[PDB]
Write an enzyme that holds these catalytic residues in place. Structure first.
Site: not given
Ligand code: 5ER
Ligand code: MG
Ligand code: 5ER
Ligand code: MG
Ligand code: MG
Ligand code: MG
Length: 716
Positions: A330, A423, A451, A532, A609, A622
């Site tokens: 990504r 998103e 997002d 995750p 984390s 995140d």
């Molecule tokens: O919903 C979003 O916009 C989206 O892009 C999700 C996420 O990036 C993450 C949500 N929890 C995480 C834990 C570890 C790595 C990525 C994620």
């Molecule tokens: Mg996102």
């Protein structure tokens, strides 16, 4: 200073050296040609990138003003929709079409299974993630709350055989449900043999075969006494390990030691929301991990990438199954710049353009033999997830950006594939057009719902106060958004061709709930969804065995289950929705979420984390959760739900709470009591109080600035 001049660019030495000494060798790309290409791609595409961002600003300004010249409350949907149409926000739907992407691997076109996302800056997590393609079901059941820690079955320092027996029984029942015997139950099995190329299961009274012999995929060891038996169901592998001489095996009625599940079929190595990277030194660490991953030689301290797994086919011959998840990367989206490269005027270069060139370059190593067979795509594709795009012109730009990079890298056109995050609202409402703009590159669409919620709040910031964060997940807009995503994918012919993906489960410790509730995603026709952790990948895999995603998607074909009006239903709080104490806990909840995440980001450069929340539920969240939390508080402050002292008190209250939760660490500097001496505390305060003024509510500009400030301060 310490930069290298290449045409109009000044490249940070660390990145220049890394590219030359580490990334380029083995690619057959001439170093001078590559760098000249970098300069030319950056020169050609930068003004277009900037124009796209200006377009977002113009649109949002018109929306802010529309709401500000406000009536007396309920929005007039017909008028609103007409307004969005006139300003070019809501564009016409193109005619029906089918995507034409080719050269994609079976893991993406056909196989429905979990998709794991991990910070690329953390080498040991990224390695565990790559290896998460195969996972112990026994470990995942025993070690989480999927098996209830009731009286007698609790986890202690040593193995609890009562709990163990429940794990075994849960797995036997899974086996009966997924790969049924002609008669009887795996619970009664006493042995497994392979006879004339077919699996034979000994029952205490007779023997039996699989109800469907074709689910027998292979074995290891001698046919008369196999060490394991490989099965397949809905395109996913299950491996019964057989070992009576083992801790668990000695207790089992058939000598069974474990059940291994094919789990993370794909993994996204993340340079975006789950990492903190604010300069060349940070980008290089990430690029070097992504490089080690594609070459097969990444190794961490305390380790290595799993080899492919060897089996004997029932028919007779040696074959191999992939030992790793197929890797996406990504990239960051179109917004941010990074001083890893500056121009002659001292202007920073667009970071999304850099990521395409560099992750694209590096990805070439995963298309060739490691020095063992090639690590990644056997069909010749590079898989890049592109987040945070707003609408079809922004998708078309990514298309052209990849096309240009392919030229620089001497790659065939359309090698670089696009996983589209759905998103942002302007993408949601123009989704079909967004897919069409990527018609020969698209390998997935995914509902990045966190997002998406942030954008929902920012877009309608001036409309009124929004519902609480916990309420958002059940609002009409988001449910319509989830269905509309699937419909658009299937109608563009994704079935058999591209992934239809759904969002992240963030409650890492709440695994029983995940197993019970995340099943709704494949039931909704999602061929994939985000987890995750490797443990969560193994458990989510159970869902693909119970739900025939392929069949579900066939049934959903042709249906239109969300209207544009439903999509456009803004999550406005209604009349007097909350009591004083409700408002207060929502504020504390959000301030705690912001502080706990920001303090690790700015002080230690950790982008994700396990962070305990206000009720101590562990959350793997995140930057997107930060976007929601800061935007919600900014929205409540903007509309008078809370006062600026309310915000202050909560930050100041929640801050020692966070210092306490992190008292364990060693690089940790407490925010209390000298709040204004804490760069992290200030960042947190700034994200709320300046939140309304951030472009589309994005957190990166404040976060990058404060992290860079912290780094500088810790060097004088
Ligand atoms: O919903 C979003 O916009 C989206 O892009 C999700 C996420 O990036 C993450 C949500 N929890 C995480 C834990 C570890 C790595 C990525 C994620
Ligand atoms: Mg996102
Ligand atoms: O009457 C309407 O429904 C409608 O939307 C009118 C217009 O948009 C405009 C009329 N003159 C213009 C000049 C420049 C830009 C827009 C316009
Ligand atoms: Mg008009
Ligand atoms: Mg509410
Ligand atoms: Mg703005």
């Amino acid at each position: 200073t310490d930069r290298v001049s290449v045409g109009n660019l000044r490249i940070a030495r660390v990145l220049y050296d890394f590219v030359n000494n580490e990334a380029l060798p083995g690619t057959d790309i001439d170093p001078d040609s590559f760098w000249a290409g970098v300069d030319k791609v950056v020169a050609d595409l930068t003004p277009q990138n900037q124009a796209l961002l200006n377009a977002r600003d113009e649109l949002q300004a018109q929306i802010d003003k529309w709401h500000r010249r406000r009536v007396i409350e309920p929005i007039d949907m017909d008028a609103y929709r007409q307004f969005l149409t006139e300003i070019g926000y809501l564009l016409p739907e193109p005619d029906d079409f089918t995507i034409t992407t080719s050269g994609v691997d079976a893991e993406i076109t056909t196989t429905a299974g979990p998709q794991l996302v991990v910070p690329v800056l953390n080498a040991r997590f990224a390695l565990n993630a790559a290896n998460a393609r195969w996972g112990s079901l026994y470990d995942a059941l025993y070690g989480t709350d999927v098996i209830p820690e009731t009286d007698g079955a609790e986890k202690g320092p040593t193995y609890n055989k009562v709990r163990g027996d429940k794990v075994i029984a849960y797995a036997r029942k899974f086996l009966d449900d997924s790969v049924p015997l002609s008669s009887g139950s795996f619970g009664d099995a006493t042995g497994f043999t392979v006879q004339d190329g077919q699996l034979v299961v000994a029952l205490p009274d007779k023997s039996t075969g699989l109800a469907n012999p074709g689910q027998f995929a292979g074995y290891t060891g001698a046919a008369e006494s196999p060490t394991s038996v490989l099965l397949i169901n809905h395109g996913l592998h299950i491996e019964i390990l057989i070992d009576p001489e083992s801790q668990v095996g000695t207790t089992d009625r058939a000598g069974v030691k474990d059940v291994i599940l094919e789990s993370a079929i794909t993994t996204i190595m993340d340079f975006e929301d789950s990492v903190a990277a604010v300069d060349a030194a940070d980008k290089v660490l990430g690029y070097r991990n992504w490089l080690g991953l594609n070459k097969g030689d990444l190794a961490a301290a305390v380790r290595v990438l799993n080899r492919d797994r060897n089996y004997t086919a029932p028919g007779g011959g040696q074959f191999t199954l992939p030992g790793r998840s197929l890797m996406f990367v990504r990239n960051v989206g179109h917004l941010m710049t990074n001083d890893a490269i500056v121009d002659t005027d001292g202007s920073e270069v667009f970071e999304g353009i850099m990521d395409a060139l560099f992750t694209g370059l590096i990805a070439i190593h995963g298309l060739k033999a490691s020095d063992g067979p090639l690590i990644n795509s056997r069909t010749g594709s590079i898989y890049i997830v592109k987040p945070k795009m707003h609408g079809p012109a922004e998708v078309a730009f990514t298309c052209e950006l990849f096309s240009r990079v392919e030229d620089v890298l001497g790659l065939p056109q359309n090698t670089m594939k696009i996983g589209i995050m759905d998103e942002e609202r302007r993408t949601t409402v123009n989704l079909k057009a967004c897919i069409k703009a990527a018609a020969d590159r698209v390998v997935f669409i995914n509902t990045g719902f966190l997002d998406r919620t942030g954008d929902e709040i920012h877009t309608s910031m001036e409309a009124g106060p929004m519902v609480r964060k916990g309420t958002m997940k059940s609002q009409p807009w988001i449910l319509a958004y989830e269905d509309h995503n699937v419909d658009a994918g299937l109608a563009a012919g994704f079935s058999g061709r591209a992934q239809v993906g759904k969002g992240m489960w963030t409650m890492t410790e709440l695994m029983a709930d995940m197993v019970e509730t995340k099943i709704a995603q494949p039931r909704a026709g999602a061929s994939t969804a985000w987890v995750p952790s490797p443990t969560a990948a193994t458990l989510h895999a159970l869902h693909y065995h119970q739900v025939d995603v392929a069949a579900v998607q066939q049934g959903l074909a042709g249906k239109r289950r969300a209207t544009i009006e439903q999509l456009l239903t803004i999550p406005l709080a209604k009349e007097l929705a909350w009591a004083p104490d409700e408002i207060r806990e929502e504020v504390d909840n959000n301030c705690q979420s912001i502080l706990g995440y920001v303090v690790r980001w700015v002080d230690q450069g950790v982008g994700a984390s396990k962070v305990p929340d206000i009720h101590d539920v562990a959350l793997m969240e995140d930057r997107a959760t930060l976007r929601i939390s800061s935007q919600l508080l900014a929205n409540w402050l903007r509309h008078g739900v809370i006062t600026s002292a309310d915000v202050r008190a909560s930050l100041e209250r929640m801050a020692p709470l966070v210092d306490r939760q992190n008292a364990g660490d060693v690089a940790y500097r407490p925010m209390a009591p000298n709040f204004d001496d804490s760069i992290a505390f200030l960042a947190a305060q700034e994200l709320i109080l300046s939140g309304a003024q951030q472009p589309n509510g994005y957190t990166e500009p404040i976060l990058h600035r404060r992290r860079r400030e912290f780094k500088a301060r810790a060097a004088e």
